[PDB]
Amino acid sequence: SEHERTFVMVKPDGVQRGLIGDIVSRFEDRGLKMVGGKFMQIDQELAEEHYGEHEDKPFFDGLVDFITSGPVFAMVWEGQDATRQVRTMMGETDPAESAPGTIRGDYGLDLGRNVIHGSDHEDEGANEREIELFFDEDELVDWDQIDSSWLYE
Amino acid sequence: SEHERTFVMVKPDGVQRGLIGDIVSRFEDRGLKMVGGKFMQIDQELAEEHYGEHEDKPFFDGLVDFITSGPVFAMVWEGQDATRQVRTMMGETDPAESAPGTIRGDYGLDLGRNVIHGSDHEDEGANEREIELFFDEDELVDWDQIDSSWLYE
Amino acid sequence: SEHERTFVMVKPDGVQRGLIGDIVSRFEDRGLKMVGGKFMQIDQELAEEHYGEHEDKPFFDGLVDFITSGPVFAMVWEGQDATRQVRTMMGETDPAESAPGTIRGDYGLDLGRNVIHGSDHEDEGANEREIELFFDEDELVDWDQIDSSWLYE
Amino acid sequence: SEHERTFVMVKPDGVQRGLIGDIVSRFEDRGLKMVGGKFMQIDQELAEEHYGEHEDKPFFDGLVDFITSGPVFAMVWEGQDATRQVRTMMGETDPAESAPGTIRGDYGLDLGRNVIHGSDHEDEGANEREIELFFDEDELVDWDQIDSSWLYE
Amino acid sequence: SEHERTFVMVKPDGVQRGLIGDIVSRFEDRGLKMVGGKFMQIDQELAEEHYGEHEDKPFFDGLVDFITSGPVFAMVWEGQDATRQVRTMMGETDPAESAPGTIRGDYGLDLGRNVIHGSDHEDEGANEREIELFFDEDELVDWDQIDSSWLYE
Amino acid sequence: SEHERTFVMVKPDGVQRGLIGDIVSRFEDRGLKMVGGKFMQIDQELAEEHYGEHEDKPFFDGLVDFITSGPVFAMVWEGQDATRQVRTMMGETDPAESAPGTIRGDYGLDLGRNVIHGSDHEDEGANEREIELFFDEDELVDWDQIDSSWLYE
């Protein structure tokens, strides 16, 4: 671990409600290093490709419409065990089952309007697929953050 | 759910120690909507009516004296599953058994000086009784917060 | 002074945008003492009294409409030089003229949506009338905050 | 204005020191709207275009080296009087001359490592060119933030 | 309980990464009272005496080298059940197994670079040994904090 | 400069009101480096030396009594133009004259309880003597903070 990466995304509800800074501050405070960041408007092709596992499900179109309703802030974050860690930080999928101190536990209320997305660490390879899906290799940035020498042994 | 309400109250210890803002910021950050707010001094009649279930208990008079010792900030908050949610946010009844990130876990130390009160969701109807007890219908405010359209499906 | 009081309210824009906590904090942080606090909706009649000095002016109805368009959080604060201090803290009337640090310089953009009101120290007695205007004497609370022992010589 | 736009970027010092969140917050807090956002590394060629006005000056290469020495977070913000407002918020050029409250007055120390850049309102069209310089039109997002309904008269 | 004390220490990673304030603010917010504070550079004698239980362990020298690599901020904190409470606040020993809202859960990533140390409440007497080890009796301060009368019954 | 040092202390009012963290943060935030840090009680003799310039003045004993009435947190900070920078950050002597943003403008109210002291840059050598006055050379720490690589050209 250490140069592990994950895809993380302030969803359109978090963007609208003015929580980009707050959320990025939590990942920066943590020592996680930003290596991708992009303010964008997901299109149909990308939305439907992102939720492909849910194609045949009834709720699919509503899901595409929401993630489409307004712009997102897509991120790639780097650090030891980043993928699991970001998921611990965000809370449970449902904000109403999330503990205070998690992103969703502090900022959210509804299951389907949960402010943020992070690659599932239990879906092996998910982080990579999501990253390549949202960022071209050129959009990613190789650097060394000041913090790194004091974050890791 | 969604227009569900609960009664919440910064107790005299939280008022004294300067935590009104901090606590209201946590509920505002969450998307919960304020529909009642009142800086007040509870009297005997109201204190004893509030803790009526504890009339015959030895500790009753001490409890009335504390909630009487200085002014409170009483609130009504609105949102999906508000009653349970506020209780998750505050922590356990004892601050010394509360997790960091909860109100009591971050700001409190003593069981009997726990900075805040929130209607018990497990006492069905408690929120309503507490609300009507502290606020007249005219003191409550029907509005729509900006946030609502992005907080709920 | 020491017991000087000033009328302050979070205007409906500031309320909508979820700035009540952050505002109350700035005042508690400062050592100012909350002695009145009332989440309310200004009715028309009250709104026209409050702006009575501008009644024969073109922009009068616009002012009335806005200030009544959503709930406010009306407050009373107590401390040495409270009125002037609160007006220093808020900024200039136009937030477009306000310094970073001040409430308006950090939170607002348009002269008309300047988020907050506070009694003008340069109009003697203003604090007095506006306090009386929004608050019956019995809504206000005499107490002693532990901070004062160290706030004042 | 209302839809006026300004180019802002967290310089490599500010990025290294973990100040991206805190910076984006100050702008969201303010009600400014993010309409462009790109974590990137300025290549040399871009860096020399951006500083083209200083090309025949001694300190030119130092400026190029620094601005390319690490990733930046480049942004576009939208609001009434955005450009001037952003420059008020940042401070003076020298942080050693900047007031507490301003981004530089709180976070920076040396004229050369002044943490952040923002288009100069006193050089008309500057915002326009620098925006175009860092962003292709299609990287920018037309949307409506719920805040504006209350941010603007 | 109430005048119970524990030894707490921002480790060299927390010092370097600029988290003294943030951590002290969490203990002050909590009502815990500072009665010892000291910015210092631990020497060999003290480091090896502190980790004496780990003398024969292979990892001992690396542990001494890290706690030696840069200065610490050593503290003594006072309050009811302080020793357990500080340990709840910091998280688990491993930051990657810590919940958001804990010090390590918010600020750390690596097991061996966990920003902070707090006396183990399950090692009876540990707090005292650690305190006497780092502070002479004269370096400690007997006072009464303002908060105390509202923190405890 | 770069290695210039300044003496700063949170006065007993600021200590009582739980402002040590918030103060240290403002300085870490800024990139100033803590090189001395000592929670202490000024004895009378020290207090009279520190205020020696006012010894033949009426208000002298009041000053001595106050500064010795409770613990202080005495500090030393290192950075380019540290002394002037710290005095800009604090505000004016009177907090009633201080701007929002400055430590005193946000946290204090009365000229006499102005929460914090910092060496005067307009009295050359002041920083030197006050540092020596509160700190033996060996209490101070030579180290390198990772921030400087990016804080200074």
Automatic annotation (TrEMBL), chains A, B, C, D, E, F:
Active-site residue list: 117
Catalytic activity entry: a ribonucleoside 5'-diphosphate + ATP = a ribonucleoside 5'-triphosphate + ADP; a 2'-deoxyribonucleoside 5'-diphosphate + ATP = a 2'-deoxyribonucleoside 5'-triphosphate + ADP
GO CC terms of this entry: cytoplasm
Pfam families given in the database record: NDK
Keywords annotated in UniProt: ATP-binding, Cytoplasm, Kinase, Magnesium, Metal-binding, Nucleotide metabolism, Nucleotide-binding, Phosphoprotein, Transferase
Subcellular location: Cytoplasm
Cofactor: Mg(2+)
Positions bound to ATP: 11, 59, 87, 93, 104, 114
Matches recorded under PROSITE patterns: NDPK_LIKE (PS51374)
Family (UniProt): Belongs to the NDK family.
Record PANTHER family: NUCLEOSIDE DIPHOSPHATE KINASE
Protein name: Nucleoside diphosphate kinase
Organism: Haloarcula quadrata
